[PDB]
Amino acid sequence: QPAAATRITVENGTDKLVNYKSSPQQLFLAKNALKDKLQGEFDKFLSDAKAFPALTADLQEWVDQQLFNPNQSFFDLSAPRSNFTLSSDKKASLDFIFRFTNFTESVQLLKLPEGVSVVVDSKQSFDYYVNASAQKLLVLPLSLPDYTLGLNYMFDHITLNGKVVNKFSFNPFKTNLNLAFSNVYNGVDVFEAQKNLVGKGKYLNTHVKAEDVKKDVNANIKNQFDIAKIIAELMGKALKEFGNQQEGQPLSFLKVMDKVKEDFEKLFNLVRPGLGKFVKDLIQSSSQAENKITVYKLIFDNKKTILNLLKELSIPELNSSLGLVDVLFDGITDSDGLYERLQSFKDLIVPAVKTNEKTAALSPLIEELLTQKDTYVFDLIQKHKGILTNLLKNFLADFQKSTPFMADQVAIFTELFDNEGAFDLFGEADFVDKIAELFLTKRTVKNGEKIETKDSLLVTSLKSLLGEKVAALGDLLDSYIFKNELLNRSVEVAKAEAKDTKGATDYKKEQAKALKKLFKHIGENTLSKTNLDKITLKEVKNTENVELEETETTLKVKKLDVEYKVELGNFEIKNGLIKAMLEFLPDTKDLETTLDKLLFKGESYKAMKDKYIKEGFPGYGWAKGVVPGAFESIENTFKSAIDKTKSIRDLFGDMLFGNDLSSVKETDSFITLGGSFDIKYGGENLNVLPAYYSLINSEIGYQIIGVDTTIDATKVKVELKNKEYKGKSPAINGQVKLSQSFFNVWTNMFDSITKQIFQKKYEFKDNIQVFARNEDNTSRLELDISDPEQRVIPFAFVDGFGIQLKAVD
Amino acid sequence: QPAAATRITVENGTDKLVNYKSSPQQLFLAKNALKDKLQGEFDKFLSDAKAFPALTADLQEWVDQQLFNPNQSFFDLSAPRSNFTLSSDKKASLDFIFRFTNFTESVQLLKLPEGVSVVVDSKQSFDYYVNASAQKLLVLPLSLPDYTLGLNYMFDHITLNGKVVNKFSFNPFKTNLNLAFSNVYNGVDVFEAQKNLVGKGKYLNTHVKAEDVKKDVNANIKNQFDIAKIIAELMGKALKEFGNQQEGQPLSFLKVMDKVKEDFEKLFNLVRPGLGKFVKDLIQSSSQAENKITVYKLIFDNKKTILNLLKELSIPELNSSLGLVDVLFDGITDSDGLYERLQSFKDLIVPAVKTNEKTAALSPLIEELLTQKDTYVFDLIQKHKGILTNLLKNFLADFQKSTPFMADQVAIFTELFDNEGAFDLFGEADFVDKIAELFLTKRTVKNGEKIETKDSLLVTSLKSLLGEKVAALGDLLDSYIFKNELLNRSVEVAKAEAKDTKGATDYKKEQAKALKKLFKHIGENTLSKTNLDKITLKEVKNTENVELEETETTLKVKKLDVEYKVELGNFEIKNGLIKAMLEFLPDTKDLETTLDKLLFKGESYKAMKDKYIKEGFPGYGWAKGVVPGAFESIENTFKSAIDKTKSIRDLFGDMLFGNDLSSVKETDSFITLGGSFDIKYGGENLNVLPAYYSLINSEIGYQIIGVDTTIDATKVKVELKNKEYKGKSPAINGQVKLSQSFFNVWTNMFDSITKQIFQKKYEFKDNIQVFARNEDNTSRLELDISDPEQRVIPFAFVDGFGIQLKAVD
């Protein structure tokens, strides 16, 4: 048999850390930091009610696995003498005597965790002595599957076989104490990592080459340009399908996604290597896709890509769910096996999800993720509208609280997703209609009495972006931009006064038609393959070697100087990119009243009117009756100039195009971009330092910080092809021609904008981070991710700022 | 024979006074004042080298005229004993013994200046004793023909016939001392007169009656109205003759004076009684008069009127020349005798005139006043141009220094009379042409290089009167009032560039024609007898008795209250009083350029133009190219409204008349005056005090001071008959009609003027001075002008302010 056991119980619980200094409330520290406090924290578990059962269980595991597991075939083990002295003084010790009794008639040897060479004859009671004086158990760390601080104990000086074994480890890599940390991880956070990762002949310096730096720097610009071009063609290949769709035939956001699915793959195989099959599979995982693929097929195939994307999420706690992914995917050859194993594990997965408050609302989702084998991501998204909208609203609110600079975009996004039906895009709907009824339609999202005056999303975005930049013409926006059924459809008012559905009354299809026309033009006239082909990113030098200097904990670029010329060719923005937007404006012929209100019936002209009526006209004085004959023809000629048959569409056509709208050809180019602009990535003595993912990962890149990315936008010509007024029937023609004057003002302001907002020799500085990947997804900078010294913890908090394991002190 | 004479020489000289206190340098004091200083001043003559011959001459005159003139027929006079003791102590005395020896054999009596009853037989030496102790000779005054202080001496206590004769006068009324005063006159100046002239039963109170006061007060208003009406008809009877004269036929200022001569008489027989023949004779004393009358005929006939007018002149010294007028006119029955006596007296008159510096320049004038018997006043005036212009300039300069309030009228008068040829009006000339070439013609009165830019008299008067009241429209006056050949004929420029005498070039007859047309209209349409007949001065109460209260040195009106209603009827100021003045303005069709300069090319509009061009247009801001399309039609419509064929005459016709000038009838009434205004001469306890002429005169009036002369101008209606625009071809017609607006402005401003400048219930206070004359020029208030107590000296200086007969002390 084996030795007697008394308290072999081993179950226990983990611990957690407390905030210190003025650090964020979410503490996710790494190892070190509490270098001295680890012993003190382990002493608490060493001197509590859970201490001696854990110690006895560890002793039992040691005396079975390490003592008689290679034995007991010919040597029975007994423990006649065995005692412990774990006292209240937090000082532990032991004294064990082991007898090996052999019943076989032969000569054998004892295998013990030491260089022991002892010969024992048959029927002989071999002696074994394990002595431990009263001493403080030392603390060493272990790496849990979650990469958390699994505190373990070791003996300092204990005698085995009568000799002292210095630095004795009591079955390392696993202890029956379960004293983990919920907020402290094994490894080096962000900066203790940049002590053994860079240097003279250390990891980063010997794994990053000058030719590699040059090729990655060039490929950074090349891939940025390529993804920009693929994005531009994508909206321009899907936009063409959107626009060309016939009226009354629904075309969902995802049915068109298939028609450009490969492009997405290309796009996402250039943003991140290996992320090519995942997105092309994702946009095919819907009922509207031509070839449906299940969620399990989506997940098992590109498991590694999903792992990288999850590790790129900002939330640390996801890594806790990421520790079982490798165990989840072990021994699986097809998606059916993965589905079966997830069904097997559901009995433990779903209670953990339900018990977690953060994922408590998520509980239904994962539910059918284990209930139906034909799950589709986008079908789930369109079916679980409420929960997904809730998380999206929370995430967007957090982003607003974190990104005040893009507050308008987050505001319009939140207003969009305030409606559950906004998730009907990812389903069986009409995108060219859903985007119109979400972004260009009044909202009534309330139930108290009525808040239907909430207007549309585009109108609110214009109000935010034109807050106070323009004031007098704001009334114009009130009469032509804020009060048009093509941008503010006025929900629930169509069936209020007509109740007969006239052709003009139904503005839901006229606005959809205008949006389809705009999509047609942006698709096959502006962002077409032919029009986007004349934008060439040509290398200029691309020859200089990017020498690297290494000296102690540093890695610098000697002289980075690469320049790429983006030649815009002749990017003809044809008439129709802005002619369709003109057609979005109402075609109401009532131009006299609106212009009269804007010019004369205002807040400043009326004050001058009154002041000149009561008194004024300096030098004259006594001629006060002349005044209501002076500011009456001044208004009269201006009013009479306005053509009775011209709307704001025609006025804006005169202002922008010059010639009248009916006489302006849609094939002509409104704006032509010619020439080229330079990109001048440069720098001297630029530091190169490791760049990690959001969570703990074995894949690492490198970043060059302080790269002067000069975008010299000069040498480009943004020319208005129609720089002269060719109109024959101007809206405000006459001796007080204002449409021509407005057109000249527009041309001058366009030249000013292209001189200041456009080319200005932009100067930027940032960090070029490249996570370069090899051919078969064997990225050059991959760490051992095994020993607790290269396990980087990017989300951890650095001890340099100051963290202590105590309650606010 | 008579008594022996030793120093009968009597010739001597006068004296003069010296300034004292802070009195004006021209001292012309009256008697009294130097009440105590007269004795001291006479002592100087009593103790000088001229004393004893004067005393001896006085003694001789006394002993011939008063002693033996009624004797020597039977009583020879001898002076065996005779001595004087006029010592250096200024104490005079005498001792005389007279023997009367009769050679006739009869009994006679001696006639002496005393109650002496003595009987002397024949051949008897009658004795006479005249004793005088050493005593100071007292001083008494005498009245010279010039009414100056003729100091005379008297003896206090001397014994005649053995008895003392108290207050002995040594031949009064004449002394051989000739100690006159050049600055002190006998009598009471202005206020010592109002001590014996008013009182309880003294002169003014007993010579002024309540009915007399009432009738004179009523006649004051009646005569003021009558002279105003006669003046208005006079220019309107002479103006008609001026206007109706044919072109090229000269009509002098005096040839027309005859055609209205009687009116002048009427006028001047209402301004001052008896001044009716003088002015009617004066304006007939010229070569241009139909019936010439000599200066002697003009002077001898109305000698009394000339005396009153000369006594009304402000200069005191003229009275010295007035002392011989009565002696001049003694024993003369016709103008021939007066001419003969002036020729006789010329040998003394002309040296006195020449020796006097003030009349030294006058010497030629009086010269022919005694050289030709056919002298004419106006022929002399037009012949002695230089001297008369010199005195007129000096008098006008003095009036300017004395009357700053009417400085503009004196300035234009001085500018007029700066030319000698300005006196050609009173001769053989053309008034309708001379007044045009003097008042509406440029002046070049200088010889240095050129001052021809002096402009005309009317232009300078407008510049003075429109100094800074209007500024912006001043440029209009520069282009239409300051630069018109009808008001600024531009002398010496007509024969500069043309040299061919075109019809338009000769502006001397076109301007004369315009002036003649204006005279025609003011003569027979506005100031005609028919039009002036409808202005009636009606008494309202004229019944209340003006009771007078007398109490010591006072005379007050108990309650003066008279009111006269001047009913203006319908005084039709026809079209032509202002239509002719419109025709004076140039008829140049260039109205666009002048109005453009006045309105747009100014000093304030251009600044606003520039400010709005550089920046501005509040609320818009970025629209700066619109501005040179905004302030271009604002000007363009205003410029295009102005009719190309309309001049400033037409614009002013639209502004004033309404309807166009060609369609405005000259017989219509531009302004009609209707209703009536009240004159409310009133007051309680109003002082009545004597009022004298400028110089010493026996004719006196009385003045009521403090009369509240309320001219309640209310209840009159000055109506514009054309208060609505009836024009069919306005100068600035269109949608920016400004001629109609200008006309409405003119109508409103006319109503405002007639509400404030016109009727306002004017309140005035003054002194009603009446020099009432009886039927045969026997004015009621005439003083004895004989005794040295009623001889008023109005020009004298009152001793109350302080005057002493010493050099500045």
Numbering used by the authors:
A (entry chain A), B (entry chain B): 60 to 868
Sentences from the paper on this structure:
Here, we report a comprehensive structural and functional analysis of the previously uncharacterized protein P116 (MPN_213). Single-particle cryo-electron microscopy of P116 reveals a homodimer presenting a previously unseen fold, forming a huge hydrophobic cavity, which is fully accessible to solvent. Lipidomics analysis shows that P116 specifically extracts lipids such as phosphatidylcholine, sphingomyelin and cholesterol. Each monomer consists of two distinct domains: the core domain (residues 246–867) and the amino-terminal domain (residues 60–245), situated distal to the dimer axis.
The core domain resembles a half-opened left hand, with four contiguous antiparallel pairs of amphipathic α-helices corresponding to the four fingers and the N-terminal domain corresponding to the thumb. The palm of the hand includes a long and well-defined central α-helix, namely the bridge helix (residues 268–304), and a rigid β-sheet of five antiparallel strands that extends to the N-terminal domain. The core domain forms a large cavity that measures 62 Å from the proximal to the distal end and 38 Å from the anterior to the posterior side. The cavity has a volume of ~18,000 Å3. For the inner part of the P116 core domain, the cryoEM maps show prominent elongated densities (with a length of 10–19 Å and a width of 4 Å) that fill most of the hydrophobic areas. Instead, the mass excess of ~13 kDa, consistently measured by multiple angle light scattering (MALS) and mass spectrometry for P116 in different preparations, could be explained by the presence of ligand molecules bound to P116.
